[PDB]
Amino acid sequence: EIDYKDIATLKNYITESGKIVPSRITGTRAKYQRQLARAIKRARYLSLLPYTDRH
Amino acid sequence: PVIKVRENEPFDVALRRFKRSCEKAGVLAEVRRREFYEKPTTERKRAKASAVKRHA
Amino acid sequence: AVVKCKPTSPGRRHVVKVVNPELHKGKPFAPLLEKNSKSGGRNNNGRITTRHIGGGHKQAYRIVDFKRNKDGIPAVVERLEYDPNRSANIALVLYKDGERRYILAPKGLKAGDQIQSGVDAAIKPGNTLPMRNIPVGSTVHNVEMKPGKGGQLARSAGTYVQIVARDGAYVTLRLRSGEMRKVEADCRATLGEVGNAEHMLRVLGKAGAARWRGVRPTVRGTAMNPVDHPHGGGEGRNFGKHPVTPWGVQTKGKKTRSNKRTDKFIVRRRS
Amino acid sequence: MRHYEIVFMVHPDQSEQVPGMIERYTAAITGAEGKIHRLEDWGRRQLAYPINKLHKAHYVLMNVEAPQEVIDELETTFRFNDAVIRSMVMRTKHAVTEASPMVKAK
Amino acid sequence: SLSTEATAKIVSEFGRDANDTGSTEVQVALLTAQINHLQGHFAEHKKDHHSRRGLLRMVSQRRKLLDYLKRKDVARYTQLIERLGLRR
RNA sequence: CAAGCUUGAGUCUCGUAGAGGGGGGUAGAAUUCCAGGUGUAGCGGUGAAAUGCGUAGAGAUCUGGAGGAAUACCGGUGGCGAAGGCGGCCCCCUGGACGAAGACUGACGCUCAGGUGCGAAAGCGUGGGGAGCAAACAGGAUUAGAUACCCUGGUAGUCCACGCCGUAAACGAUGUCGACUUGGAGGUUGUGCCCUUGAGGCGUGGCUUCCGGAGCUAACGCGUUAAGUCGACCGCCUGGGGA
RNA sequence: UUAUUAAAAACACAGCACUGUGCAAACACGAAAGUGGACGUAUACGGUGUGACGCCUGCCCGGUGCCGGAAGGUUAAUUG
DSSP states (O other): OOOTTOHHHHGGGBOTTSOBOOHHHHTOOHHHHHHHHHHHHHHHHTTSSOSSSOO | OOOOOOTTOOHHHHHHHHHHHHHHHTHHHHHHHSSSOOOHHHHHHHHHHHHHHSOO | OEEEOOOSSTTTSSOEEEOOTTBOOSOOOGGGEEEOOOOTTBOTTSOBSSSSBOOOOOOEEEOBOOSOOOBSOOEEEEEEEOOTTSSSOEEEEEETTSOEEEEEOBTTOOTTOEEOBSTTOOSSTTOEEEGGGSOTTOEEESBOSSTTTOOOBSOSTTOOEEEEEEETTEEEEEOTTSOEEEEETTSEEEESOBSOGGGGGOBOOSHHHHHHTTBOOOOOGGGSOTTTOTTOOTTTTOOOSOOBOTTSOBOSSOOOOOOSSSGGGEEEOOO | OOEEEEEEEEOGGGSTHHHHHHHHHHHHHHHTTOEEEEEEEEEEEOOSSOSSSOOSEEEEEEEEEOOHHHHHHHHHHHHHOSSEEEEEEEEESSOOOSOOHHHHTO | OOOHHHHHHHHHHHSSSSSOOSSHHHHHHHHHHHHHHHHHHHHHOTTOHHHHHHHHHHHHHHHHHHHHHHHHOHHHHHHHHHHHTOOO
């Protein structure tokens, strides 16, 4: 149920520089971590999330 | 690792905060990792050795 | 298809020919033919002005529509035809009002495809539009350099041009030579690229195969006497001089373009 | 007839051409025996990074059930339309008629 | 693979019942349908070796089923190979 | 030989996970190059240097553009694949595996000389492409010498399409298939049960990592994923060189 | 191919490479107009060398040439 349009939820799993946080830090399952990575990449494409802190 | 020196903070604490942020971002480790080419077999062997020594 | 002939003869050993089963096996469209008399490379003074031209098979000229100024009216491709006057193949198209014309056959075109010219034509191979209505980055051919003059660039087999930039009333094109040129946006171009791309893979195989194309032998300058060529004679094989044309102009390096009239359109020379 | 999720951004200067674009797209989708599960006009949104030296793009979301021919025509339309600065078509497992978080925020 | 409707149609026309999905005739017919369908995919994707391995698995399985059927009852074998257009 | 049977082997229904494969598109970061603005004497490199670039304005910084290649974070003794291998995102075509409850066929099976197919990298042929890296090559160093390590460049190549090559420490140095034999801690992926208390507990499959018991082994070690106890078939070995 | 003492290992050749050429093309014949190139458009055309195919094609940019560079030095008519 992870949606790339849920930026409020996706921002909890990215650092201050926009990088995805590892599953060891947030303690999320591997399956939902993969879903989160896919959703974050899609949201980066739609310019809803930044690729980096620069641009 | 953007650090905005907020009001009522000395320069030294801002510099130490900048260093802490740049080390938690891991930029120096990455730019030292990327300066020479590491063969896929070399990086696989290194990852395997690190995963093995992470058992104590 | 590209096929290699079996070496049943020394002249057939290296022949590599291009066969196209979709080409029309029959006579061309008569109302679009003209007499095309050979010249032997002679001008109106009767002098040889271009060497190594002469003979070859008799050829009839096909009137190819390079302007493509019949806008709005759709047309369908009847058949692809061989054209002896150019390296590309030509397509006989039939407009809705009953007119038949010859166009350069782009890559991928086949009998039954529908093409159209004009500002409202769809963006697909075979359609002709003013270059200001064509998206930047697309690959086109049969490009005009003056509006309404007729296509002059990218007409050979397999060639094409890509629009790299558009600004104001001009667009920038990357020609097949690698040269960046400016052309005003009102010039027309046809989408896609010219067909028969494997034309360059053919191998003539024997000396006579070039004679069929009207190419006479080339005598090396160093094989002549000093009175005939700057590369002169000598006892044995001697060169000892810088290579030049038969008229003494240095070849192998010396640039000969001298045209200040069109320099403003050359963004960057080939390299 | 598969389900798709279409998101496309329009140039901020072309915000009033968006209703006409949506009208044409729904016409093309329902003309081919297709359905439209969800349609959301998010309006202008600040871009996380500049796209074509631009900030504040206009977002639209569509959830349609349509064959592949009309979806290919829609992708071609997006590619050739100069106002659509960015688009993305994605398949979904089933129909989605729930309001997206972008409009669920209100 | 094959859709559910095509599979049901094959099972119905080649089976002794609508539930006889395990008969040798039904299996050979399904394998032949999948091979014929894959034929068009591999005409366009000549460099897809990983899927061609599964195609050859299907071919060999159909061959073994046809051998078993011919050894078991040759009459049904002939009816099947004429109804499906086999024998090279 | 004839007729059976369902437990081996397959088919169907519904779902699940996956860098499995082929095709097309696109995104951002970065390197290089081109043009311009600011700006001035250095930059680069090294153990130290020099070759090299730089007052013809380099390096730094800012703006715009071009092109190719690879996809940071996720990312993990994680996943998929017969193996080789597979890593941005999206779409189209497509193979395999697994699980739940049933229905179906009824030994249709295992192995396989010869045969065929796939087969990293390098290499070859044709046509493109070529930013970075970099055999050969050139120069500067080091050295007794230095046809090397180090430095500055740099061609093939690496990239794409189609063919060829058919080899690797192609490794788990462990052929495939099946049965049986104490355990512990994990990972990953289904599924079932219960005021579901909870991101819960208890079962039940698939794959997978580490330790270890009997046993086996020359020892090291393997140890239910055996190198233990067996069965079927195949490949291979017979002292070191020559080879 | 040396008509009439030389037919050859000479010339040509398919193939290869370099180089020029963006079209009013380069180039050639023309005091010029013009014409050829070509009713062709870089998979095209001209020039040069090599000479099917196979395996290949190493080092030298000091000299000469060509290409690029534009700072500086020198330098014509002109100006006075």
